[PDB]
Point group: D3
């Protein structure tokens, strides 16, 4: 399926790309485009360079706000699969040091610059966004991004879609800490009523609660 | 979020109030307003006195059928949090003896009058409603209320919303008997195709079946 | 509830019949009508002879393409409950040899003719449909049917509806192999984006993935 | 394997009989012989009439205290499989009314006399033993027997052996209440340090705790 | 820990070797030496060539019945880790064709000769032993070996030790079929009261039953 | 039951005290006495002051090596229930700062001195013992103690007894991290073949492995 753009709020757009992975077939991955004054910033690549180049072109030609910089929410190919495209298209890329290290271990290109959030609960302000490291969950390095004007929380792959009980790709997950990481994000951003998972539809805070439940160690 | 009213059938309305509870945020609670000839009856308060007073005012001014009496489906603050408002507004309140006893233990005000349904499976007719005690489930005292004109079954908190697998607040639950209590209610009221949970959207009998499954002891 | 017809694609219709089964009440069962040149073929009966006769009549009078033959996807009464009606109405019925044997053991009438797909993974072409035996799942004999013009995969009862975690009627299930059988079907028919379960709404490939997850042996 | 006798305390003996049940093979069942002044009483038959007759003969010839009466701890064939032998050998048999009713439903002979313990928690003194009905567990009618001189608690099949996590034959079990029934027995007889399960070795109170854990509804 | 020999029955000995595997440390692996007229046969190597050579030497010097041939119960290094030693010491090695193929895939040396048991339930007589392929379990190729004079069933790694609930190394397991494979072995060899797991102490049929329970798909 | 002493190795003794806790009854708690030149050190109190005073007296009168100092492995009453006795008897008590803080929160007396091991994996040498903080498990502050002459690892309550699947008192447990904490201890002390849990019998490394399994987040 081709690459789709949907408006989530004032100056906040979701990009969605698809990849066919047998046996189940097409799987979506979502990220964001965030408008700033006369440029935009990007949260996550799509699956590959071609899809990522389509996102850059859309921001330049449709929003008229070319992508200047990007952040990447963990070291997997749905979030960093299009790094060569971003680099060739002049986008200045950012990730945590741990994400960059895991990217190299996993055969992905690291970002060009470092987000200094290494402790659990650490937050910074980057291009009008709040970036939090809530601890390991879907991947040890996963970060979340909050946009405080529209109160949109981008949970990425740490937040599971809808009412699923499937945990998704758990190859790199911290099964012990994931539910606490979700609680940490939910407590850090109480005003965000719109929550974006990477692999499903935009939703509300019910997907925070559901994710924390389905990934929580039980008695 | 403010207090909402939705029509479910002839003379049957749902009231919904919200409370912000970290980490997950707003949580709805639902109850009913049931029209009678020139007055109405209430199933459950909302979370607090202010929301409950808004329900009384709506019945008086919008339906023109002031609330005369109420029933309360178990001793938690989403169902009995607005008792002082009901009492001050002249509403005559009813609950089972067990609910009244648990209300006192839990720091809530008991109802002024007793519903005589203490045995499992016992039912009475109260203001045109059938009230059943199906046994302990979400709380040991939980009762259910059936409105037989429109065939609406109010399951309250004993029925979980939608397709969730979360059990909600289980602090006071009877985990051994809950699925049997749901079966008891479903068998008692086969004609009710509309089922109302306290913490989600109106639905059909699929939420009876799903609740019984997700709360059933497994092998 | 009465018997319903819904168009799924060019020349492909879903039939749905209901049965009241306490405690939960009405349960739907779905099958298909597949148009051919001047006749049609049927996938599955409804619950009983009366509902099945209504399907035959609809194909004759509304589609003007009378049902000539049928296939049955496993030996339970939602799929073979209307065999006497089909036989009396001149429909030539087909099932696997294992389905016919299990039908007799279960008190159902067997089909008049045999589908030769006894090995796991075996497929045949029957009236423009691909019929696959993917191995035991909901029932040891369950088969799936793919319509390759519209790319519709009829999973029958081997595919669970929506986002449920309930396994349905497991009296005859192969709990060890069911998730592999679902994977086998999904790998055999990658182009089918429309998936039909017997007991829920038409959906996409997400119900293949969800079924395989909820029925998969866990660690 | 043949029928075995082991001394558990002053005047208290365990009888053990075996039955070959494929696939796993021999399975033991245990009961007790309790000496009184110049006669004895029996707790449970063995699997069949021949084994039960061997127990009667042993009490008469070895203890010199012929069995006068018996109690039966629930309606399954390991506990009531030898009723014809007891009746022919002049033993006066006792069970609860519920056990007698379930015996008839299950194709076993009922006892000749009734133990009046129908409410949960009800206890009586019978031939120097305390008999408690703790509620449904392995079977809805299961009772337990405490011998207060030696402080031996006969849990029968309601108590699982050793450190197993298997629940045994659950065809007739009350999965919701079983762990509470075990707690009820443990609270009723705090001084009993010797605990006898039907299907394993004599042990201590650790098998009460383990049984309650492995059969307890979990979150 | 060094290599140990223990007599299990007339002409049947267990060999046990140890390997230190962090974090848990020493892990035993067991196999058998089976005496024949003036030679012996071997079931499984130990972990490595040195331990396996010690087994060959013990049979030659202590039993005075040199090992002529061997069978290997699946393709893992505890069972086939000492193949070079056996081959150099003149032992003629046998395994199923599937075991030989999986050995090559897993970096182990295959056996020199083939055991023709490829269908589930197939059995052959080899050097007075019955060898059964019961279907996939701990590994897809696992076979079991029964010695009918002493009625000793060697379950190898398909049978878990004692009362554990741990499944051991499941990297290559068939989680769907394992409990059925255990049932198949138990039904094939009802007279064997001594059961040998690879990674624990000799035991009785209770470890067949426990293994089947702990590895069985649950509802 | 009264207070028991058992020799575990040269200069290393286990002390065991009992407390009756309904419904299950007596529960043991274990700690150690470690001989040094002409004095000893203590690992953990018993349940109360009287039992703890008996341990001090035994070291003075039987070993002739009076207890000079003690360490406490977490803030629960089985480990710190006898602090007043130790303090009155002149024993100099040590615990981590986190244990002292949790002791105060839980109504126990803190130790007089601090063990400086606050980071996960931190170790110190104290009176010839290695003390490790492996991360939260049974309690967030739990530490383990290794005696390297006899290679005895005292796991305290972080290690569950025998082959149980019960988690014990989990009121204060870190369910996400406990299995990793056990792995951390097992990796830190590979030479210790004797492992002491607080609530069961001395055992080997199998109880490390079993604990890590039964408390590990599963898929
Ligand atoms: Cl979604
Ligand atoms: Cl809902
Ligand atoms: Cl659906
Ligand atoms: Cl036992
Ligand atoms: Cl063992
Ligand atoms: Cl123990
Ligand atoms: Mg540049
Ligand atoms: Mg008044
Ligand atoms: Mg004809
Ligand atoms: Mg008589
Ligand atoms: Mg040769
Ligand atoms: Mg001093
Ligand atoms: Zn990822
Ligand atoms: Zn992802
Ligand atoms: Zn409630
Ligand atoms: Zn509620
Ligand atoms: Zn079916
Ligand atoms: Zn069906
Ligand atoms: Zn029984
Ligand atoms: Zn029994
Ligand atoms: Zn293996
Ligand atoms: Zn092995
Ligand atoms: Zn503790
Ligand atoms: Zn403890």
């Amino acid at each position: 399926k081709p690459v789709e753009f949907v408006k989530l709020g004032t100056g906040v757009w979701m990009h969605t790309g698809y990849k066919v992975v047998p046996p189940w077939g097409n799987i979506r991955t979502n990220g964001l485009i965030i408008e700033r004054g006369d440029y935009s910033v990007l949260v996550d690549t799509a699956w590959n360079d071609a899809q990522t180049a389509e996102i850059v072109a859309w921001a330049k030609d449709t929003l008229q706000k070319p992508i200047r910089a990007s952040i990447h929410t963990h070291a997997h190919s749905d979030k960093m699969g299009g790094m060569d495209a971003l680099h060739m298209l002049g986008v200045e890329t950012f990730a945590t040091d741990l994400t960059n290290r895991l990217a190299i271990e996993r055969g992905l290109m690291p970002a060009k610059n470092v987000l200094n959030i290494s402790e659990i609960g650490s937050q910074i302000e980057w291009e009008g966004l709040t970036i939090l490291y809530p601890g390991g969950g879907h991947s040890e390095d996963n970060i979340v991004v909050n946009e405080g004007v529209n109160n949109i929380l981008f949970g990425g792959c740490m937040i599971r879609p809808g009412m699923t009980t499937s945990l998704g790709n758990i190859d790199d997950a911290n099964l012990g800490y994931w539910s606490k990481a979700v609680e940490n994000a939910a407590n850090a951003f109480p005003d965000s009523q719109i929550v974006i998972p990477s692999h499903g539809k935009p939703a509300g805070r019910e997907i925070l609660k559901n994710t924390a439940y389905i990934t929580r160690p039980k008695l």
